Write an enzyme that holds these catalytic residues in place. Structure first.
Site: not given
Ligand SMILES: COc1nc(N2C[C@H]3C(=O)N(C)C(=N)N[C@@]3(c3ccc(C#N)s3)C2)nc(C)c1F
Length: 384
Positions: A36, A229
């Site tokens: 990610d 992303d």
């Molecule tokens: C690993 O720890 C964390 N994870 C995340 N994210 C936000 C999500 C998101 O909306 N997007 C777009 C992204 N790029 N990553 C996340 C995802 C969750 C499921 C996915 C799949 N498939 S990707 C995970 N945000 C914060 C602030 C964290 F501390």
């Protein structure tokens, strides 16, 4: 150069994300971890969940260290902070002491059938939770080893649906830690500056649909930011840009009428096996700020990138993978599947080259081309 031990180390697809195998603890506990570039925490399932067939068992690791601190992230998850020894089996041959957020409670975070049990946030400390003092994995890796401060991603969309067995047996791409593998791309690498080190923020300076300029003030394309992303499936565009782009894509593809649900990314569209009319859909070019003053370059994707294959029958079905955003442009797996992307942290820049695994047809290919003379590119960046 050539990093054979890391080539083909990813699995997955654009909708459920791409993951790499990692190990945590002593003796090593194997987990599949989502790659990610949109977050900065290393967080793993650490308690039973209906959608997890394995999880991190801290009590079984002799090298586990409890940081005695919770972390609450509203999907949503809650966890307990600690450190442990971490390795990437198909990666650099090193073991790092890294922060790990042990997920104890979650809501709509773990997806049924994704095959991943945690997330590897590869972005910068600024956006780490609870705050920037929690060192991200990649920062730890670079500080503790001689691994160069760079990684590169080749995300490989199959171009057709993969069933449960096929997605487990298929190569979904490569994550090259500490280098660039020349077998993963064709042509030249073109670099755009990383505007600021938080997300992997970039500046888009022009947008075309089949060579036709969208002709918006370029600040609109980066309102309120533009990021790369791997954790997002779609190409997401700011509301006004999305409205202008979808109108242009509809006009270019107007020989066939699609329902409103298709354009909203909700409804699939199907064609008889092998008859997808790729040629009616336009190519999309995003121009990015170059490294040289007044210079830009463009990356061009095909409908084979922005039409995501989905199972329905023997028809070939897809969902429109371009959608609206209220948080800026997101260059998700749609974009990334067309290119080999170099996250050159050492030189504060992101490189793009045509991917050796991008899906195309006999008439068109994805492209990375330049240079173009482009003035006042700093004005394209949004402030406040
Ligand atoms: C690993 O720890 C964390 N994870 C995340 N994210 C936000 C999500 C998101 O909306 N997007 C777009 C992204 N790029 N990553 C996340 C995802 C969750 C499921 C996915 C799949 N498939 S990707 C995970 N945000 C914060 C602030 C964290 F501390």
């Amino acid at each position: 150069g050539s990093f054979v031990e890391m080539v083909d180390n990813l699995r997955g697809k654009s909708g459920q994300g791409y993951y790499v195998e990692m190990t945590v603890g002593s003796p090593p506990q194997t987990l599949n971890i989502l790659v990610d570039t949109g977050s900065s925490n290393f967080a793993v399932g650490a308690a039973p969940h209906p959608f997890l067939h394995r999880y991190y068992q801290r009590q079984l690791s002799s090298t586990y260290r409890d940081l005695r601190k919770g972390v609450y992230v509203p999907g949503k998850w809650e966890g307990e902070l600690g450190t442990d020894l971490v390795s990437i089996p198909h990666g650099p041959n090193v073991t790092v002491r890294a922060n790990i957020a042990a997920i104890t409670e979650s809501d709509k975070f773990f997806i049924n059938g994704s095959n991943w049990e945690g997330i590897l946030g590869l972005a910068y400390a600024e956006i780490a939770r609870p705050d920037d003092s929690l060192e991200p994995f990649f920062d730890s890796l670079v500080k503790q080893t001689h691994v160069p401060n760079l990684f590169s991603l080749q995300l490989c969309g199959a171009g057709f649906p993969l069933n449960q067995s096929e997605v487990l047996a298929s190569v979904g791409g490569s994550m090259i830690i500490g280098g660039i593998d020349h077998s993963l791309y064709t042509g030249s690498l073109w670099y755009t500056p990383i505007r600021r080190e938080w997300y992997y923020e970039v500046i888009i300076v022009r947008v075309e649909i089949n060579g036709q300029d969208l002709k918006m003030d370029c600040k609109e394309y980066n309102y309120d930011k533009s990021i790369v992303d791997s954790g997002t499936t779609n190409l997401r565009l700011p509301k006004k840009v999305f409205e202008a782009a979808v109108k242009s894509i509809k006009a270019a593809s107007s020989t066939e009428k699609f329902p409103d649900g298709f354009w909203l990314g909700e409804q699939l569209v199907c064609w008889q096996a092998g008859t997808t009319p790729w040629n009616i859909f336009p190519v999309i070019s995003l121009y990015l700020m170059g490294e040289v003053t007044n210079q830009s370059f463009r990356i061009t994707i095909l409908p084979q990138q922005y039409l995501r294959p989905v199972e329905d029958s023997q028809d070939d079905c897809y969902k429109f993978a371009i959608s609206q955003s209220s948080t800026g442009t997101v260059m998700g797996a749609v974009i990334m599947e067309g290119f080999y992307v170099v996250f050159d942290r050492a030189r504060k820049r992101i490189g793009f080259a045509v991917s050796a695994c991008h899906v195309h047809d006999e008439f068109r290919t994805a492209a990375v081309e330049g240079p173009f003379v482009t003035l006042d590119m700093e004005d394209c960046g949004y402030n406040i």
